[PDB]
Amino acid sequence: KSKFEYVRDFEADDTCLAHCWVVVRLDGRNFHRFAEKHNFAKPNDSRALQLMTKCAQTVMEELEDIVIAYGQSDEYSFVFKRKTNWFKRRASKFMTHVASQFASSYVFYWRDYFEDQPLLYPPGFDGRVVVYPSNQTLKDYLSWRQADCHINNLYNTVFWALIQQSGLTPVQAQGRLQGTLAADKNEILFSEFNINYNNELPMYRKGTVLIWQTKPVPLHCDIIGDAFWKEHPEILDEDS
Amino acid sequence: KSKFEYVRDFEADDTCLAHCWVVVRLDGRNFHRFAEKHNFAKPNDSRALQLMTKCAQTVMEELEDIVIAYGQSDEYSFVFKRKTNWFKRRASKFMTHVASQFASSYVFYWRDYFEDQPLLYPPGFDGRVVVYPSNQTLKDYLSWRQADCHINNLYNTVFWALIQQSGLTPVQAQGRLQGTLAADKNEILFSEFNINYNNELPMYRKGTVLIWQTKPVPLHCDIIGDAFWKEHPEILDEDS
Amino acid sequence: KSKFEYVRDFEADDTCLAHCWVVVRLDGRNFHRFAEKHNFAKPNDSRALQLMTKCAQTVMEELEDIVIAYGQSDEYSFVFKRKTNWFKRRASKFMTHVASQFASSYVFYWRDYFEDQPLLYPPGFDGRVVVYPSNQTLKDYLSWRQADCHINNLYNTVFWALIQQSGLTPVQAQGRLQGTLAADKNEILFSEFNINYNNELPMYRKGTVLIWQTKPVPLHCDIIGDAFWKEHPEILDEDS
Amino acid sequence: KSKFEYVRDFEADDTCLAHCWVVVRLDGRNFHRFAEKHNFAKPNDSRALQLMTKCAQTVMEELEDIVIAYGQSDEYSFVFKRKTNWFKRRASKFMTHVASQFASSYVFYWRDYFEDQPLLYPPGFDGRVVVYPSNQTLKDYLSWRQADCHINNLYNTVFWALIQQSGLTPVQAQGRLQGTLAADKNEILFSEFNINYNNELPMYRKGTVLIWQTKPVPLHCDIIGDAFWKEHPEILDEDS
């Protein structure tokens, strides 16, 4: 009826396996450069982290069926309940709606966190969809991301202390931490800089978790252990 | 090494058929409501359309391998050259990078087009990826979208003239145009409102095309016929 | 190096979600006609059913990682252990190796079951692959197929008794059983034909299950209830 | 209605890109062992090759929309016309129907080609589906397979001559042909065994092509050059 309509036949199905956890993970694109251009504090910047969380909250409020979100550094993951049928579970739908809504928010609420530092340009975001077949796999995924947060924060805190406090060159710091263990990094922070790693802000150490409590509220607790899951059984126990 | 790492095994491949045209199409999410809340002019609003185009330009500048974009109303399509290997041609990568970069820009440059009308909230965008196997199919796709622009603008121009000038109720206008042909709509515009449809702004009639000429420049020309393609052979004749 | 080799780029990935149950189900193609042309006994034919089972055994013996198979009427399903990496879990590999090996066997061993009735032509088989994310879903799948066996055998036994013993026309039998319940079908079998449905051969009532006990042995037991699974825990409890 | 029916939700879509060539390629599984056990003549065996072709003919006759088939050694490829909608273009359907029908035939017609040599066991077949976006890619695929035929036959003919006529050990033959060029292999065949490679049976040199002329007829002509395609334009020029 448009003799051009036939081009619709080319659209492919990208349905996520039914009754499975659907996760959309976002990553700030070239945020290493973005951070430099906007003078992000090292090793951690409250403005940046909280802005990310604000965006994640917006995504959870504007979209449907997201039961939990976890973010750290330049990433954020959104877990959609496994019984969802939001867009016939079309992978592309999950991806673009989360990526777009997050990006628009990032710019929209920028001023609420960077009152002075001006936004030099509209940033991009890397996104992906992953389907986890069980509760244990989803948990192991979140644990994987939280553990990543811990590993990187421990490394970056010592790293920047060696540079910003000891005056080592980036290259010197690196060689210095080469082959070091978790306990060593902790030892260096305590001896060289009188820093007790365990007293660092929870947000920097554990990242941020968002769950419905109704609005999506921030928590910087451990999600690797069972405690968290035993306290919020509504998330993993939902139907389907 | 995190005993949680196994969760990466769940990531699925979403590679686009090699040596084929890859198109990412975006649609403003619930833009019918967005338009109302931001007092978009009917049947066409220069601010809205130009803002879209500005975002499309940003996407073409920040991403890689896009050789042509076409936009109209609340949509924009981006055509990546078929020999691209940007992200191993992972569909999700095309989608999220285009959707996010577009959305962030939409908010970022909003003021350059809506100097007075304030942005009430960060909008979302619907996205999708389609693979077209040949030059002819890609052309028919673009033609399909431009033809859609024509059909909708002709209808909307009469429709809103009947409401805004003749004072018919939305429902009256609709029944009035029910079963009408292209030639009739044109006749009504000419007799009832002394409007020559063919003299309406090119942008509203044909939409907008972006190609590299180096920066991405706007053109409101016809792309259904051969003229355009004969004049810009670099686009479809590129290797692979 | 063949300047034609590039065509390999077109091959797409079809990997089954990792650590999930992979099932290949086969259906005799146009076996309604095949059955007629080979004078299959109604409602059940021992030769046909046992031949199917023999083929299923061959598939389990020649391929790798199949832990259980279930067959009935003209179908057979093969369950590959979830930790398998046989062909990098490529769906096409599971499909074609099962479908081909089964078909070749169907013809090869035909004489061992149809000593007199000659094979009129080499038949085809319909195949598919399905991924079940959990032990419960796999069980429900097998239950679904066994329950189907029960529903169809109960219906077919009465149906053919009404035709073959009472002399009703296929159409008369159908209208007669229209809207009948399980208990009714059982009542008719008992009153009209002095048939105790529960005494029919186990194979016709429950179908056939193949598991390793080493060779794949036939069992016509119930697999919907827990008994079976409690007795053969090795199947569902295997690693990954 | 079976409270088990929900398991159907797990079935995934595997539709082949519309208006594209769909190819199903089969490979005899472990046919190196099969060949030995059935005393296949080296370097070529007419019985084996013709049996394969017979099977391919059966596949083309029993299935729908196959416009061309090409086989050599232990493989056979089936090209389905690009406008086909046979099974909604479900990849699995193409695969299993071709693989099963081929395998059953292989056993069924075995005696018509191996009147004496008995079939020791029902063989299996490896299968796969590939979608080629254009006429040139499909041609390059067929060329790729025919060229493979040439390369292997030239190599195997010298190779087995060196063993069967010169008495070299398999390992000696190999080292002897190591680093040799096409012209060299030809030279050795002519000087050492008074063999004119170009006079070898066409079937062994070019393989076999099947096209509709109505029944599917065998041809051992070149399909790399344009001659073949100019003479049978009906194949590549068909609609869609």
Curated annotation (Swiss-Prot), chains A, B, C, D:
It catalyses: a 5'-end ribonucleotide-tRNA(His) + GTP + ATP + H2O = a 5'-end phospho-guanosine-ribonucleotide-tRNA(His) + AMP + 2 diphosphate + H(+). One of its GO terms (biological process) is tRNA processing. Pfam families: Thg1, Thg1C. Changing residue 185 to A: Reduces activity by 98.5%. Disulfide bonds: none annotated. It comes from the Eukaryota. Mg(2+) 1 binds at residues 27-28, 74. GO terms for cellular component: cytosol; mitochondrial outer membrane; mitochondrion; transferase complex. Transmembrane segments: none annotated. Changing residue 236 to P: Found in a patient with a severe multisystemic growth disorder and cerebellar atrophy; uncertain significance. Binds 2 magnesium ions per subunit. Its EC number is 2.7.7.79. The keyword Mitochondrion applies. It is found in: Cytoplasm; Mitochondrion outer membrane. PANTHER family: TRNA(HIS) GUANYLYLTRANSFERASE-RELATED (PTHR12729:SF6). It is linked to Spinocerebellar ataxia, autosomal recessive, 28: A form of spinocerebellar ataxia, a clinically and genetically heterogeneous group of cerebellar disorders due to degeneration of the cerebellum with variable involvement of the brainstem and spinal cord. SCAR28 patients manifest mild motor developmental delay, gait ataxia, and dysarthria. Some patients show mildly impaired intellectual development. Disease onset is in early childhood. This is Probable tRNA(His) guanylyltransferase. It comes from Homo sapiens (Human). The lineage of its organism: Eukaryota, Metazoa, Chordata, Craniata, Vertebrata. The gene is THG1L.
